[PDB]
Swiss-Prot record, chain A:
Changing residue 50 to V: In MCAHS3; decreased function in GPI-anchor attachment to protein; reduced amounts of GPI-anchored proteins in homozygous patient cells. Heteropentamer. Part of the GPI-anchor transamidase complex, consisting of PIGK, PIGT, PIGS, PIGU and GAA1. Belongs to the PIGT family. The disulfide bond between PIGK/GPI8 and PIGT is important for normal enzyme activity. The chain holds residues 311 to 414 of 578 of the full protein. It is found in: Endoplasmic reticulum membrane. Glycans are attached at residue 17. This is GPI-anchor transamidase component PIGT. Component of the glycosylphosphatidylinositol-anchor (GPI-anchor) transamidase (GPI-T) complex that catalyzes the formation of the linkage between a proprotein and a GPI-anchor and participates in GPI anchored protein biosynthesis. May play a crucial role in GPI-T complex assembly in the luminal layer. Binds GPI-anchor. Changing residue 17 to Q: No effect on function in GPI-anchor attachment to protein. It is linked to Multiple congenital anomalies-hypotonia-seizures syndrome 3: An autosomal recessive syndrome characterized by distinct facial features, intellectual disability, hypotonia and seizures, in combination with abnormal skeletal, endocrine, and ophthalmologic findings including impaired vision, as well as abnormal motility of the eyes. Paroxysmal nocturnal hemoglobinuria 2: A disorder characterized by hemolytic anemia with hemoglobinuria, thromboses in large vessels, and a deficiency in hematopoiesis. Red blood cell breakdown with release of hemoglobin into the urine is manifested most prominently by dark-colored urine in the morning.
Swiss-Prot record, chain B:
Pathway: Glycolipid biosynthesis; glycosylphosphatidylinositol-anchor biosynthesis. Keywords: Disease variant, Endoplasmic reticulum, Epilepsy, GPI-anchor biosynthesis, Intellectual disability, Membrane, Transmembrane, Transmembrane helix. It is found in: Endoplasmic reticulum membrane. One of its GO terms (biological process) is attachment of GPI anchor to protein. One of its GO terms (molecular function) is GPI-anchor transamidase activity. Residues 22-77, 244-285, 372-383 are lumenal. It comes from the Eukaryota. Residues 1-2, 99-135, 205-221, 306-310, 345-353 are cytoplasmic. Changing residue 382 to K: In NEDBSS; decreases GPI anchored protein biosynthesis. It comes from Homo sapiens (Human). This is GPI-anchor transamidase component PIGU. Component of the glycosylphosphatidylinositol-anchor (GPI-anchor) transamidase (GPI-T) complex that catalyzes the formation of the linkage between a proprotein and a GPI-anchor and participates in GPI anchored protein biosynthesis. Binds the lipid portion of GPI-anchor. May act as an organizer in the transmembrane layer to recruit other subunits, and thus is essential for assembly of the complex. Heteropentamer. Part of the GPI-anchor transamidase complex, consisting of PIGK, PIGT, PIGS, PIGU and GAA1.
C-alpha cells in the first residue's frame, strides 16, 4: 500500500542539536468502523480440537480475504514427538470441499 | 455340523451389526481392545506412509510386520469381512482341534481302563462320550461369542489374525502334521515373539502322538526333536528373510521385536508393564525389563517337567501365561485361552474359588472403561485407578489359571490313588 512517512533526520542540526531535545508527539486514536483499514489479505489462527487426554486435532485456519485473487501459501508444521500424528487423517478443506496441496 | 453353522451365523451377524453401529469408533479406540502393535488406525497410517515414499518403520506409530502390510495392501477394502472371516476360521480350527483331542484322550482313557491302571472306584471321574459330545461346540462358542473377541474383531485388530495363527498351529499339532505345525508356529512367532514358548508343548504332543518315549537315553526322541526344531527355525528364518525384501531393509526387526522386548510406548493397557515403567527409577530399568521379559519364558521348562504326559493342558497354560504377562496384552489375547475353558470344565468339582474369581474378572473388565473415562476425559481420577484395575484383573487371571491347574492336578491324583 502507498504509505506516507514523516522523516526526522537526527543528523540535521536544523532539527535536533545540543540546545534542545526531540520529543515527537503523534495524535492517534482508534479510527471509527468506516475509516478502519481493510483486513489484511492473509491471516491465520491455530487451535486444538477436542477434549480429554487421549486424542485431538491440530487445526489451522487460513484466511484469504482477497475478493478475487487466489494465491499459494506454504504451511510449515513442527510437532513434538509425544504428539504422535497420523498423516492419513490430514484433511485440507477450503470452501467446504477437499483441497489437494500442490506439494506435501 | 448344523449347530456349528448356527453358532457361526450368530457370531457373524453380531459382529456385522456392531460393525455398522455407532459404537465401532468407540470400540476401535479402546486401550484394552487395541494395542500399539495391533491398532487398525496404525495399519492405515503405515499404509498411507508408503504412498508418500516414507518407510512406515521410520516413525513411531507403525509397529506391524511386513506380512500384515502386504495382506492389507490388497485387502484394505473388505477389512471387516477379513476380520469376520479370521474369527470364523479361528472358531473352526479350535472346533476341529478339540474334536480330535477328545477322541485321542478317550482312546488313552480306554487304554488305561483296560490295563486297570486307575483306582478301583473312580467311576465318577471317568469321562464318557455323552459328556464330551458338545465340548467342541462349546469351545467355538466361548470364542465367537466372547465379548473380548467381539470387541477385538470389531476394532479390527490384528490380534484376531495372530489368534487364528495360534489356533491353526494347535489344530495342525493335534492332527499330526509336524511340517504344518512348524510353519504355523513360525508364523505365530513372527507376529508376536512370545508364542515361541509353545514349541515345547507342540513337540511333546507330537512325540506322544507318534509313540516315542521322551527319555534322555532314547535316540528317536532326539532325532524327532531335532527335525522339529530345524523345521521351525528354518520356517522362521525363511519368513524373516523373505519379508526383508518387501521394503528391502531390516528396519522392521527393530520396530517390531525391539518394541515388543523393550516396551518403549508406556501407553495404558490391561498389562502390568505400562505403569511399572512409567513410574520407575532409571537405575534399574534394564534389570527390571529383563526380569519381566524373562517372566514369560520362565515357566515353560518347569511346566514341561510336571506336564510331560499332558501336553494340551500345558499348551493351554502357556497360552494363558503369554496372554497375562505379554508386554502389550489385549483382551483379544485373553479371549484365546478362555476358549479352552469348556475343555477343562470336567475339573469343576475340584475347582475352588471359581465364583469369586469370575466375579472379579467381570468387575475389572466392566470397570476398565469407566475408570479410563474418569481418568482421561472426566479428569476426576488419576492413573492410579486404572493401575489398580489392571492389578486386580491380572491377579484374578493368575488365580483362575492356577486354580484350573490345581483342579487338574487333583483329578490326576484322585484317578491314580483313589477317590473316597
Ligand atoms: C542331536 C541334538 C538335537 C538338538 C535339537 C533338540 C532340541 C531339544 C529342545 C527341547 C526339548 C523339549 C522337550 C522337553 C521335555 C521335558 C520333560 C522331561 O523332563 O523328560 C525327561 C527326559 O529328559 C529330556 O528328554 C529333556 C532333555 C532336553 C535338553 C536339550 C537342551 C538343548 C536344546 C536347545 C534348544 C533348540 C531349539 C530351538 C528352537 C526353539 C524324563 O522325565 P520323566 O518324567 O519321564 O522321568 C522318567 C525318569 O525318572 C527320568 O529318566 P531320564 O534319564 O530320561 O531323565 C534324565 C533327567 C531329566 O531331567 C530333566 O528333566 C532336565 C531336562 C529338562 C528339559 C529341557 C528342555 C530344553 O533326569 C535325571 O535323572 C537328572 C536329575 C537332575 C536333572 C535336572 C535337575 C535340575 C534341572 C535342570 C538343571 C539345572 C540348571 C538350570 C536349568 C537350565 C538347563 C541347563
Ligand atoms: C463388553 C465389555 C465388558 C464385558 C465384560 C464381560 C467379559 C467376561 C468374559 C469372561 C469372564 C469369564 C472368566 C471365568 C470363566 C469361567 C469358565 C467356565 O465356564 O466356568 C464355569 C463356571 O461358571 C461360573 O461359575 C461363573 C458364573 C457365576 C457368576 C457369573 C454370572 C453373573 C454375571 C452376569 C453379569 C452380567 C449379566 C447381564 C446379562 C447376562 C463352569 O461351568 P460348567 O463346568 O460348564 O458346569 C457344568 C459342570 N459339569
Ligand atoms: C493370509 C492368511 C495367512 C491370514 C488371513 C486369512 C485368509 C485365509 C483370508 C482372510 C480374508 C480373506 C479374503 C477376504 C476377501 C476376499 C475377496 C474375494 O473376492 C471378492 O470379493 C472380490 C470382488 C471384486 O474385487 O470385485 C476373494 C477371496 C478373498 C481375497 C479372501 C481370501 C482369503 C482371506 C485372505
Ligand atoms: C529368527 C532367528 C532364527 C534369527 C535369524 C537371524 C537373521 C535372519 C536376522 C535376525 C536379526 C537380524 C539383524 C537385526 C538388526 C540388524 C541391524 C541392521 O542395521 C541397522 O540398520 C541398525 C538398526 C538398529 O540397530 O537400530 C542391519 C541388519 C541387522 C544386522 C539384522 C541382520 C539379519 C538378522 C541377523
Ligand atoms: C524373530 C525373532 C526370533 C527375532 C530375534 C531377534 C531379537 C531378539 C533382537 C533383534 C533386534 C534386537 C533389538 C535391536 C535394538 C535394540 C535397541 C537397544 O537400545 C538402544 O538403543 C541401546 C543401544 C546401545 O546399547 O548402544 C535395546 C535392545 C534392542 C531393543 C534389541 C533387542 C533384541 C532384538 C529385538
Ligand atoms: C528372544 C527369546 C527367545 C529369549 C528370551 C528373552 C528374554 C528372556 C530377555 C533375554 C534378553 C532380554 C533383552 C536384553 C536387552 C534389552 C535391551 C533393553 O534396552 C533398554 O535399555 C531400553 C528399554 C528400557 O531400558 O526400558 C530393553 C530390554 C531388552 C530388549 C531385553 C528384554 C528381555 C530379553 C529379550
Ligand atoms: C541549534 O542550535 C542553535 C544554537 O543554540 C539554536 O538556536 C537552534 O534552535 C538549534 N536548533 C533547533 C532545531 O532548535
Amino acid at each position: 500500500t502507498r504509505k506516507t512517512y514523516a522523516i526526522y533526520d537526527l543528523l540535521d542540526t536544523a532539527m535536533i542539536n545540543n540546545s534542545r531535545n526531540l520529543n515527537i508527539q503523534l495524535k492517534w486514536k482508534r479510527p471509527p468502523e468506516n475509516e478502519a483499514p481493510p483486513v489484511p489479505f492473509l491471516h491465520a489462527q491455530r487451535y486444538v480440537s477436542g477434549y480429554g487426554l487421549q486424542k485431538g486435532e491440530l487445526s489451522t485456519l487460513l484466511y484469504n480475504t482477497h475478493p478475487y485473487r487466489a494465491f499459494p501459501v506454504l504451511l510449515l508444521d513442527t510437532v513434538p514427538w509425544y504428539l504422535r500424528l497420523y498423516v492419513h487423517t490430514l484433511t485440507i478443506t477450503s470452501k467446504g470441499k477437499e483441497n489437494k496441496p500442490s506439494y506435501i | 455340523a448344523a449347530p456349528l453353522v448356527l453358532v457361526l451365523v450368530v457370531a457373524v451377524t453380531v459382529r456385522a451389526a456392531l460393525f455398522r453401529s455407532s459404537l465401532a469408533e468407540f470400540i476401535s479406540e479402546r486401550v484394552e481392545v487395541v494395542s500399539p502393535l495391533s491398532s487398525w488406525k496404525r495399519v492405515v497410517e503405515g499404509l498411507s506412509l508408503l504412498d508418500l515414499g516414507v518407510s512406515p518403520y521410520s516413525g513411531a506409530v507403525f509397529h506391524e510386520t511386513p506380512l500384515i502390510i502386504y495382506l492389507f495392501h490388497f485387502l484394505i477394502d473388505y477389512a471387516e469381512l477379513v476380520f469376520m472371516i479370521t474369527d470364523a476360521l479361528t472358531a473352526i480350527a479350535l472346533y476341529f482341534a478339540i474334536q480330535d483331542f477328545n477322541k485321542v484322550v478317550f482312546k488313552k482313557q480306554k487304554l488305561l481302563l483296560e490295563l486297570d491302571q486307575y483306582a478301583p472306584d473312580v467311576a465318577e471321574l471317568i469321562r464318557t462320550p455323552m459328556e464330551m459330545r458338545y465340548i467342541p461346540l462349546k469351545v467355538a462358542l466361548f470364542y465367537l461369542l466372547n465379548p473380548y473377541t467381539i470387541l477385538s474383531c470389531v476394532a479390527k485388530s490384528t490380534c484376531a489374525i495372530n489368534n487364528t495363527l495360534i489356533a491353526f498351529f494347535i489344530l495342525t499339532t493335534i492332527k499330526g502334521s509336524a511340517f504344518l505345525s512348524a510353519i504355523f508356529l513360525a508364523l505365530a512367532t513372527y507376529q508376536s515373539l512370545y508364542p515361541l514358548t509353545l514349541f515345547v508343548p507342540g513337540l511333546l504332543y507330537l512325540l506322544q502322538r507318534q509313540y516315542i518315549p521322551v527319555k534322555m537315553k532314547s535316540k528317536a526322541f532326539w532325532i524327532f526333536s531335532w527335525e522339529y526344531a530345524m523345521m521351525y527355525v528354518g520356517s522362521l528364518v525363511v519368513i524373516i528373510c523373505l519379508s526383508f525384501f518387501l521394503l528391502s531393509s531390516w528396519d522392521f526387526i527393530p520396530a517390531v521385536y525391539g518394541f515388543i522386548l523393550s516396551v518403549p510406548d508406556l501407553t495404558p493397557n490391561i498389562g502390568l508393564f505400562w505403569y511399572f515403567f512409567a513410574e520407575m527409577f532409571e537405575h534399574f530399568s534394564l534389570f527390571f525389563v529383563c526380569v519381566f521379559q524373562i517372566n514369560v519364558f520362565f515357566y515353560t521348562i518347569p511346566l514341561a517337567i510336571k506336564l510331560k504326559e499332558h501336553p494340551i493342558f500345558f499348551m493351554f497354560i502357556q497360552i494363558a501365561v503369554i496372554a497375562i504377562f505379554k508386554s502389550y496384552p489385549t483382551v483379544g489375547d485373553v479371549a484365546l485361552y478362555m476358549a479352552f475353558f469348556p475343555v477343562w470344565n470336567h475339573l469343576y468339582r475340584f475347582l475352588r474359588n471359581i465364583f469369586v474369581l469370575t466375579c472379579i474378572i467381570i468387575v475389572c473388565s466392566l470397570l476398565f472403561p469407566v475408570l479410563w473415562h474418569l481418568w482421561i476425559y472426566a479428569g476426576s481420577a488419576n492413573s492410579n485407578f486404572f493401575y489398580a484395575i489392571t492389578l486386580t484383573f491380572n491377579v484374578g487371571q493368575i488365580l483362575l489359571i492356577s486354580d484350573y491347574f490345581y483342579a487338574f492336578l487333583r483329578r490326576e491324583y484322585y484317578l491314580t490313588h483313589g477317590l473316597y
